[PDB]
Amino acid sequence: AEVPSGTVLAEKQELVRHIKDEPASLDPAKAVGLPEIQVIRDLFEGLVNQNEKGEIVPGVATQWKSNDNRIWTFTLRDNAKWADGTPVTAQDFVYSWQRLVDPKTLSPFAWFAALAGINNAQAIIDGKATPDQLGVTAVDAHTLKIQLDKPLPWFVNLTANFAFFPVQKANVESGKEWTKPGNLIGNGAYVLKERVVNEKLVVVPNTHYWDNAKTVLQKVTFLPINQESAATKRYLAGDIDITESFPKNMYQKLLKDIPGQVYTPPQLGTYYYAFNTQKGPTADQRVRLALSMTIDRRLMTEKVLGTGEKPAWHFTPDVTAGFTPEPSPFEQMSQEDLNAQAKTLLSAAGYGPQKPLKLTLLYNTSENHQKIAIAVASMWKKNLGVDVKLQNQEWKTYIDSRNTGNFDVIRASWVGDYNEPSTFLTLLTSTHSGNISRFNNPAYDKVLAQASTENTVKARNADYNAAEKILMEQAPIAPIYQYTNGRLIKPWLKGYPINNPEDVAYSRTMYIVKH
Structure with a gap:
C-alpha cells in the first residue's frame, strides 16, 4: 500500500470484505466465479x-x-x-x-x-x-x-x-487437502489462516511476500453473503467495510443516505445491439446509422436503468486501460438533431411510406433484455418513426439465430477477457468467431492488424481510435451502455481500486485511516 505522508492510520488494521457467495476452489486452475478469484488475488x-x-x-x-x-x-x-x-x-x-x-x-x-x-x-x-x-x-x-x-x-x-x-508443485501434489487453511501455500501478499465453510475466510500477511514491507492490513476477513439486500444492511450496521453490488430498489435510498460511500464506476463491458450487415435493410450503412443514432442512450441509462450505467459512445469502454478515445460527434448533439439526421439517412436509403422499414429486434427470453428492447423499440417509433417488432426466443433458439445470422437486430454483450482495447475491437474483424454482425470491412481489418504491430500503448491507441471511428461511421453494431458494478465503501477504507474497470483488487494496497 502507498500511504500518503501525514495520514493517520487506525490502530487496528483489519478489514472485512463482502463477497457474493461461498468461494468454490481456491486453486487458480479450478476457480470458476468471482468469490474465489477475489480471494485468490490475495493468496497468489x-x-x-x-x-x-x-x-x-x-x-x-x-x-x-x-x-x-x-x-x-x-x-x-x-x-x-x-x-x-x-x-x-x-x-x-x-x-x-x-x-x-x-x-x-x-x-x-x-x-x-x-x-x-x-x-x-x-x-x-x-x-x-x-x-x-x-x-x-x-x-x-x-x-x-x-x-x-x-x-x-x-x-x-x-x-x-x-x-x-x-x-x-509440492503443495498441490499433497492431495485434495492442499487448499485448506494452514495448508495452502501461495505466493501472494497473504496466506489463508482460518476458514469456516459458508461463513468466513481469514487471511493474514504472507511475511515472505517480496513487497511485505508495504503491506498494511494485518487481517482480512472475507464474508460470503449471497443475500442481495442483507449485505447492504450489515454494511450499514458496521459489520462490513466494503460490499459488492446492491439492488436497484435500494440505490436511490443509498444515494440519499450515504452518497459519499456509493460507487458505480464504469466496468469492462458493453451492452450492444448487433445489426445484420450482410442481409436485409440492415445491410445498408445508412439504415444502421439511423437506428444507432435514434437510440437515446441518456434516456436509457438515466430512466430505464437508473443504476449508474454510462452511455456507450464507443464499443470499447472509455475506462479501458491504454484507451484514450476521441469523442464521438454524437455525444454533444441533442437527441432532436440526431433524430433529424437519422430520418434523412433513412429517406436516402429509400425507406418511407412507399417502402416502410420492417425490422424485428431479437433477444432471448429475459426480464432484463425485454425491458431494454421495449425501451429501444419505443425510441425507434418516436424518434425515427419506424415500427420495429420484438421477438423473444428460448436460449437455444436465440443462440442459433445469433450464430447463423437469422436476425435483423439482436441483443448482444461483451465483457472484456482482459483490460486492453483489443478484447473488444478484435470482435469486429471480418473473420473473428465473435463477429455477430458479420461486419466485413477491409479498412477495419487493416487497422486492427496494425494494432498487433505496435509495441507502445500510445501508438496502439491511435489504431484503436481509428477502429472506433469506423464502427461509429459504419455502425455494424450499436453500443448502448457500459456496465457498472456498484459498491459501498466505508469512509475509513482507503486504497481500494474502485476505478479499475475489471474490479481487480489486492488487499495489499488497502489501509484503514483513523475515523
Whole structure:
C-alpha cells in the first residue's frame, strides 16, 4: 500500500470484505466465479499485477520484453517467495501453465491460455499434444521465455489473470487437502489462516511476500453473503467495510443516505445491439446509422436503468486501460438533431411510406433484455418513426439465430477477457468467431492488424481510435451502455481500486485511516 505522508492510520488494521457467495476452489486452475478469484488475488501473484489505472506493474516478474510481440522474455525477481519461505522461480510457472492446459486438470479457464496464444495450448487441452509442448520455457531460475502462435503486443496484460497464477508443485501434489487453511501455500501478499465453510475466510500477511514491507492490513476477513439486500444492511450496521453490488430498489435510498460511500464506476463491458450487415435493410450503412443514432442512450441509462450505467459512445469502454478515445460527434448533439439526421439517412436509403422499414429486434427470453428492447423499440417509433417488432426466443433458439445470422437486430454483450482495447475491437474483424454482425470491412481489418504491430500503448491507441471511428461511421453494431458494478465503501477504507474497470483488487494496497 502507498500511504500518503501525514495520514493517520487506525490502530487496528483489519478489514472485512463482502463477497457474493461461498468461494468454490481456491486453486487458480479450478476457480470458476468471482468469490474465489477475489480471494485468490490475495493468496497468489502472477508475473505482473494490474493497478487501479489498469497499468501493468511488476509481480513476480520485474521486467518483460518482446521486439516481435511473439516471443516474450520475463525476468523474475530473486526474492519472490511462497508462504513457506521457498523461492518462486521460472519452473513454477512452467509447471503451473502446463497444469492449466493439462486435460487432467479440467480447468474451467484452460481456454484462456489459447486466447493468450501460448503455443500449442489448444492442442494440449484437446489431448493431441503432451503438456511439455506448451510454449513456455524456464531458461534459468529467473528467466521465463514464452512462444506465442501470433503477435500479441498486449500479451503481458493477460499474465495478470488468475489463471496464469503459479501454484507450488509440492503443495498441490499433497492431495485434495492442499487448499485448506494452514495448508495452502501461495505466493501472494497473504496466506489463508482460518476458514469456516459458508461463513468466513481469514487471511493474514504472507511475511515472505517480496513487497511485505508495504503491506498494511494485518487481517482480512472475507464474508460470503449471497443475500442481495442483507449485505447492504450489515454494511450499514458496521459489520462490513466494503460490499459488492446492491439492488436497484435500494440505490436511490443509498444515494440519499450515504452518497459519499456509493460507487458505480464504469466496468469492462458493453451492452450492444448487433445489426445484420450482410442481409436485409440492415445491410445498408445508412439504415444502421439511423437506428444507432435514434437510440437515446441518456434516456436509457438515466430512466430505464437508473443504476449508474454510462452511455456507450464507443464499443470499447472509455475506462479501458491504454484507451484514450476521441469523442464521438454524437455525444454533444441533442437527441432532436440526431433524430433529424437519422430520418434523412433513412429517406436516402429509400425507406418511407412507399417502402416502410420492417425490422424485428431479437433477444432471448429475459426480464432484463425485454425491458431494454421495449425501451429501444419505443425510441425507434418516436424518434425515427419506424415500427420495429420484438421477438423473444428460448436460449437455444436465440443462440442459433445469433450464430447463423437469422436476425435483423439482436441483443448482444461483451465483457472484456482482459483490460486492453483489443478484447473488444478484435470482435469486429471480418473473420473473428465473435463477429455477430458479420461486419466485413477491409479498412477495419487493416487497422486492427496494425494494432498487433505496435509495441507502445500510445501508438496502439491511435489504431484503436481509428477502429472506433469506423464502427461509429459504419455502425455494424450499436453500443448502448457500459456496465457498472456498484459498491459501498466505508469512509475509513482507503486504497481500494474502485476505478479499475475489471474490479481487480489486492488487499495489499488497502489501509484503514483513523475515523
